[PDB]
Amino acid sequence: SGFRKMAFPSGKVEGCMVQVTCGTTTLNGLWLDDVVYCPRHVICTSEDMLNPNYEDLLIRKSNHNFLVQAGNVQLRVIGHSMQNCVLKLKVDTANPKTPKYKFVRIQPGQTFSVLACYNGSPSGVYQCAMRPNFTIKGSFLNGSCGSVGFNIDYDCVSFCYMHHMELPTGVHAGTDLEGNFYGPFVDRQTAQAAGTDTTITVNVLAWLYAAVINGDRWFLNRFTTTLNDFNLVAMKYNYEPLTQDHVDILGPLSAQTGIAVLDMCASLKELLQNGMNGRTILGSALLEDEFTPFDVVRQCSGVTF
């Protein structure tokens, strides 16, 4: 029993992290096969960052500009291209630690583990969620850019996030590993607004199912509701709409606990209106929306990798 914010083991990803230096700038790169992936803002000086033209900057650059260290060990760049906001540096050696991997683009609400890195070296690992406003509430300092978010599927590592930018509000913006930004953010030094951060309703319901499983039941109410009535109340508290797709994803947790999805909705409806009244759920005073239905099953069923 017990329920913690839990990351996947990071060993397989650690072996793919390298330092990328171009001129003065230094950040992190992902070495899979004979390709190194990093943010393209690596080629910018302080001047360029205000209003970069990446085509015009990348035109003047050649293979030999890019210093790549994998440990205390030089890697030879024998080619480079630009795919959106990501630089792909072809290297003369394939990574012998390359695990089974794929590149996926995640929806808002989906969680992933982040391996925070500086100068190509792992600092630590934490769980994140892609927010409805397409930001993430991560923990990143200068030179963190090129740190990746991942999910493990027994043997296979799914890379879904590369870190590119912090917004003045202190939340974070990045791309998938094809270099397309989550949300409408750009790799440029200008003030960018995130928008309304909403609560991932289906993730909250998942966390309440986790609570009941760990014998935390006080919030179970004596009322029920419909999906439409719940949504009308939810959206007034800036909670994301609950869909039929979301109800079906919660099926396994509904089966395990013997509490219909719509009953759990009704308990959450009451919590929104009445508040927690100083009470905690799984040792938390707020409602948590950064555990997926699959995160809860994984941690409660005991899935290994």
UniProtKB/Swiss-Prot annotation:
Residues 1-305 are cytoplasmic. It catalyses: TSAVLQ-|-SGFRK-NH2 and SGVTFQ-|-GKFKK the two peptides corresponding to the two self-cleavage sites of the SARS 3C-like proteinase are the two most reactive peptide substrates. The enzyme exhibits a strong preference for substrates containing Gln at P1 position and Leu at P2 position. Residues 1-305 form the Peptidase C30 domain. There is a cross-link at residues 5, 90 (Glycyl lysine isopeptide (Lys-Gly) (interchain with G-Cter in ubiquitin)). Changing residue 90 to R: In strain: Beta/B.1.351. The active site is at 41 (for 3cl-pro activity), 145 (for 3cl-pro activity). It is found in: Host cytoplasm; Host Golgi apparatus; Host nucleus. Inhibited by pyridone-containing alpha-ketoamides compounds 13a and 13b. In turn, alpha-ketoamide 13b (tert-butyl (1-((S)-1-(((S)-4-(benzylamino)-3,4-dioxo-1-((S)-2-oxopyrrolidin-3-yl)butan-2-yl)amino)-3-cyclopropyl-1-oxopropan-2-yl)-2-oxo-1,2-dihydropyridin-3-yl)carbamate) inhibits SARS-CoV-2 replication in human lung cells. Inhibited ex vivo by michael acceptor inhibitor N3. Inhibited ex vivo by compound 11a and 11b. Cleaves the C-terminus of replicase polyprotein at 11 sites. Recognizes substrates containing the core sequence [ILMVF]-Q-|-[SGACN]. Cleaves and inactivates human TRMT1, preventing tRNA guanine(26)-dimethylation of tRNAs. May cleave human NLRP1 in lung epithelial cells, thereby activating the NLRP1 inflammasome pathway. May cleave human GSDMD, triggering alternative GSDME-mediated epithelial cell death upon activation of the NLRP1 inflammasome, which may enhance the release interleukins 1B, 6, 16 and 18. Also able to bind an ADP-ribose-1''-phosphate (ADRP). 3CL-PRO exists as monomer and homodimer. Only the homodimer shows catalytic activity. Interacts with host FBXO22; this interaction promotes the proteasomal degradation of nsp5. This is 3C-like proteinase nsp5. It comes from Severe acute respiratory syndrome coronavirus 2. The chain holds residues 3264 to 3568 of 4405 of the full protein.
